[PDB]
């Protein structure tokens, strides 16, 4: 509340865990600027039908591994948020036919496990790689190397198993994606392989809630943050630096002064024109801005009057295998989550994801009926009651959902998206070192960017050197 200045661009989980270390510190004086009218960012729930969904993040995953995922304990005992382990074991039983019904379970099986191991052997071949990625790879590449073939899975099973393993993961083809960066996944080897949903009507932003309410007052009575520290409603439009210190100037035609600033919006946020520099940030920052990826992950929410769906044992993840790759194919059924809600979930990604968004709910829930109505020739099927349809990639204070790490960026100039400009600090998933893209490396990197300027604030290191 006396020393150095701090505004913190943004509330979500990055911002507000960043203010808390800085809090810590002994950096109090903080100016959160939330864009929004709430804190949590991507972790964001919702009302549908009767239920709370979640329109961001839904799962803690990498979990039951070697070391402790540090969102798990939070959710598990902390707050001891509703959660169920997430059980893909079943698949094979559960991909449906573009024209009728499910295909042979043995037979979808086979391709399972011969995708599994092109993979394993992508694996293998990412550890052999050098450290400059000099010789790095999309993952398609190394797919066309192991199955002998100028293209990657091509026929409709084979391309849904795939966007299955991998669209359904980091929200764009394997073909843009890099190899080394992916295969395999440091959340995954580091945290365990396990990923849990949670379904507490709180909302997984209790996460953020909770740790806001860390270090920020929040009432006695009513438990809202009440901390002038923490603004609402405040759009950052610019951000002045220079050597002295730095203005920042939201839309509401506010100026503040700080000594430093920390910028947590999403990599989207920053490819936009929302957040103007002065003076223009440097060429290198720029291009490692603009030449990372910000993939776009939609949850398209469904209500029925009745359900016509297989629930039961390994029932609540199928697949359709269209023929046009990446076509309402990845479903989840709620029977543990919401039952009996009656509800489904498709996933969609990337060029299906902006398309969607840019059309009419009526207009995407008739494709919807239309794929369900092929799936279950059997059954007799109701249209939907009520649609979701998450705009994330629209809206102009995130423009996607979480980065992914595409093939020509090295780690070096990974680290030129992490790397601060003069006063000027970025947090963010898309700047974990090792967990972009996961609220568990958006909370990190909070930690971590915190304590670059910590360092230098307090201990008078401030050339950051990228490598
Ligand atoms: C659909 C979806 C699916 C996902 N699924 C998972 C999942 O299951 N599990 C997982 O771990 N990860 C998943 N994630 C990713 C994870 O949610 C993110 O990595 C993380 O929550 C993002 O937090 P952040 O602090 O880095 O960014 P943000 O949460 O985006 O924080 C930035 C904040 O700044 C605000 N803002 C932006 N611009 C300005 C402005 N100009 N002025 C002031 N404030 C600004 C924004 O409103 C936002 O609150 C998902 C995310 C989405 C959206
Ligand atoms: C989470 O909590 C449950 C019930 O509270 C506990 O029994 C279990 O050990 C925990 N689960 C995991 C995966 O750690």
Redesign the pocket.
């Known amino acids: 509340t006396v020393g150095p200045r701090v505004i913190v661009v943004g509330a979500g989980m990055s911002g507000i865990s960043a203010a808390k270390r800085l809090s810590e510190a002994g950096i109090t004086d903080l100016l959160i600027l939330e864009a929004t009218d709430h804190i949590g960012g991507r972790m964001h729930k919702t009302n549908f039908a009767g239920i709370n969904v979640e329109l961001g993040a839904n799962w803690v995953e990498g979990?039951?591994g070697g070391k402790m995922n540090p969102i798990?304990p939070i959710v598990?005992?902390t707050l001891?948020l509703r959660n169920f382990?997430s059980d893909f074991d079943y698949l094979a039983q559960n991909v449906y036919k573009e024209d009728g019904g499910v295909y042979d379970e043995d037979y979808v099986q086979k391709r399972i496990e011969l995708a599994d191991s092109v993979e394993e052997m992508g694996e293998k071949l990412s550890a052999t790689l050098h450290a400059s990625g000099r010789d790095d790879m999309s993952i398609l590449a190394m797919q066309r190397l192991n199955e002998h073939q100028p293209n990657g899975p091509a026929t409709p099973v084979d391309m849904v198993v795939d966007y299955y393993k991998f669209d359904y993961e980091f929200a764009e083809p394997p073909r843009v994606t890099s190899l080394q960066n992916t295969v395999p996944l440091a959340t995954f080897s580091d945290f365990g392989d396990?990923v849990?949903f949670v379904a507490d009507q709180r909302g997984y932003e209790a996460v953020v809630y909770y740790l806001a309410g860390q270090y920020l007052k929040t009432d006695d009575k009513s438990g809202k943050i009440v901390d002038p520290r923490l603004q609402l409603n405040k759009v950052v439009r610019e951000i002045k630096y220079s050597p002295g210190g730095v203005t920042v100037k939201t839309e509401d035609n506010s100026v503040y002064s700080a000594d430093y600033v920390m910028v947590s919006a999403s990599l989207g946020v920053l490819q936009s024109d929302l957040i103007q520099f002065k003076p223009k940030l440097p060429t290198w920052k720029v291009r490692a801005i603009y030449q990372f990826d910000m993939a776009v992950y939609t949850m398209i929410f469904l209500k029925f009057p009745r359900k016509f769906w297989p629930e039961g044992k390994g029932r609540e993840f199928f697949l359709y295998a269209s023929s046009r790759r990446g076509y309402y194919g990845v479903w989840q059924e709620f029977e543990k989550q919401y039952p009996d809600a009656n509800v489904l979930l498709v996933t969609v990604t990337d060029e299906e994801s902006r398309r969607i968004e840019q059309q009419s709910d009526e207009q995407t829930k008739a494709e919807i009926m239309q794929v369900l109505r092929k799936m279950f020739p059997g059954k007799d099927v109701p249209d939907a009651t009520d649609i979701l349809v998450p705009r994330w990639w629209s809206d102009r204070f995130y423009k996607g959902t979480f980065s992914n790490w595409p093939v020509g960026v090295n780690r070096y100039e990974y680290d030129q998206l992490r790397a601060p400009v003069g006063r000027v600090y970025f947090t963010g998933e898309h700047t974990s070192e090792h967990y972009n893209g996961y609220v568990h490396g958006a909370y990190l990197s909070g930690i971590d960017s915190a304590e670059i300027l910590i360092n230098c604030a307090q201990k008078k290191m401030c050339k950051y050197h990228v490598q």
């Open positions: 979990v039951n798990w598990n005992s001891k382990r396990d849990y």
